Design a protein around this ligand. Structure first.
Ligand code: HEM
Ligand SMILES: Clc1ccc(CO[C@H](Cn2ccnc2)c2ccc(Cl)cc2Cl)c(Cl)c1
Length: 402
């Protein structure tokens, strides 16, 4: 009759945009690096819930990133579209992972990201121009948080922004669908589009990273055509959805901590540190922590057995009080160094410094151009995405001094 379990259902949903779900707070407080959970289909898996243990297991080659493994810890039926072959390098292990990742790294270097700053500022202020010209109220998501990173990543990739309604919609359907059929359709829509773009570039060599992969690696048989599609799709979707969620959740969080938001406005040298703290605190991508053991792993007396699924839950690890004193306190002045919002090791987020640039430019622009920005509804009225996808809000009504 008692319902207590030692393998609670995973994932949990946030009720507050920037707070751990109650069940995650429970996992955070329970000693030990690992904890059993039950996934949507009844299967048991391990979650990693402490900070150094998370780094250790992210660096352990025995925890494979191969999503096509039958034992990979899928958290929803929609996962079967990500289990579609071929995998982009996020789903590959060394040595294949490295050969594919190095086809893309040149677009994400510190020198390239620095070169992008004028363009990102132009895009950010252009969409602010438009949203502010029309006056309040507005949905910050559709009008600003999503189009800005979309326009930026399209230029990076060589994908025509003219088609943005098409791939923004497909991107949403892929990331947010709860059934395999809906996800597979969205994936097929994007794949067919990207396959046509490849053919166009074979006719007329094109700009951007897709153009470069077509002209070089594909022409040399060094990447499969369908790998190129998967790779472009990874970057296109991650380029859209991640940054947009950080923007909306950071605005919500900062407006709920007005003393720190005011301190940030008063001293813009605090923005880089504030971005690190917001990344640590909001940790929007637990959905990207899944691994499968290819061999037994001993972890501080607990045994992960070959064939078991393991989810490195970076949001919980980022609230490890042995690393971040008073971990559930937002503190833009703390050292948020070593946070795991981008992962750790060979798969650490390729876009991390583009994301850091965009959030810095965005926060500075909002504080510059809309210092009176405020939510047009109460926080409790917003609808948070579930834990089976990237954290965030699908709409964010805002107003300001016209
Ligand atoms: C705040 C925004 C973002 C967050 C929190 C985030 C989070 C993450 C995390 C946790 C991983 C590790 C996945 C794993 O270990 O399996 C990852 C990988 C990756 N992210 Fe992001 N990401 C963000 C933005 C972006 C953007 C803008 C891009 C644009 C291309 C991007 C592209 C990638 C890629 C390509 C990988 C795979 C890297 C590899 O496997 O070597 N991410 N991201
Ligand atoms: Cl078929 C297919 C192929 C690629 C993706 C995108 O891959 C990124 C991984 N990522 C996260 C942060 N940086 C990179 C992701 C995975 C899951 C979700 Cl819910 C949201 C995102 Cl943005 C998706 Cl969604 C579906």
């Amino acid at each position: 009759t008692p319902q207590t379990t030692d393998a609670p259902a995973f994932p949990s949903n946030r009720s507050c945009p920037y707070q751990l779900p109650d069940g995650y707070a429970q996992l955070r407080d329970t000693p030990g690096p690992l904890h059993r959970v039950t996934l949507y289909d009844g299967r048991q898996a391990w979650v990693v819930t402490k900070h150094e243990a998370a780094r250790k297991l992210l660096g352990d080659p025995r925890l494979s990133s191969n999503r096509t493994d039958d034992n990979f810890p899928a958290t929803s039926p929609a996962f079967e579209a990500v289990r579609e072959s071929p995998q982009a390098f996020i789903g590959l292990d060394p040595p294949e992972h490295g050969t594919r990742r190095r086809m893309t790294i040149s677009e994400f270097t510190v020198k390239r990201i620095k070169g992008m700053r004028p363009e990102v500022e132009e895009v950010v202020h252009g969409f602010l121009d438009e949203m502010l010209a029309a006056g309040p109220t507005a949905d910050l998501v559709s009008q600003f948080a999503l189009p800005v990173p979309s326009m930026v990543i399209c230029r990076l990739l060589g994908v025509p922004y003219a088609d943005h309604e098409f791939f923004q919609d497909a991107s949403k359907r892929l990331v947010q669908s709860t059934d395999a059929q809906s996800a597979l359709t969205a994936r097929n829509d994007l794949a067919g589009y990207l396959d046509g773009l490849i053919t166009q570039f074979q006719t007329e060599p094109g700009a951007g990273l897709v153009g470069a992969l077509v002209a070089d690696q594909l022409a040399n048989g060094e990447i499969d055509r369908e790998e190129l599609i998967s790779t472009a799709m990874l970057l296109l979707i991650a380029g859209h959805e991640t940054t947009a969620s950080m923007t909306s959740l950071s605005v919500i969080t900062l407006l709920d901590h007005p003393e720190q938001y005011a301190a940030l406005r008063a001293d813009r040298s605090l923005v880089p540190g504030a971005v690190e703290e917001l990344l640590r605190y909001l940790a929007i991508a637990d959905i990207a922590g899944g691994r499968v053991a290819t061999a037994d792993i001993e972890v501080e007396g607990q045994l992960i057995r070959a064939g078991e699924g393991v989810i490195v839950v970076n949001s919980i690890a980022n609230r490890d009080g042995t690393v971040y004193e008073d971990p559930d306190a937002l503190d833009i002045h703390r050292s948020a160094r070593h946070h795991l919002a981008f992962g750790f090791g060979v798969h650490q987020c390729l876009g991390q410094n583009l994301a850091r640039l965009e959030l810095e430019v965005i926060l500075n622009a909002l504080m510059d151009r809309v210092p009176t920005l405020r939510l047009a509804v109460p926080v409790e009225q917003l609808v948070l995405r579930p834990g089976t996808t990237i954290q965030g809000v699908n709409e964010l009504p805002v107003t300001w001094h016209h």
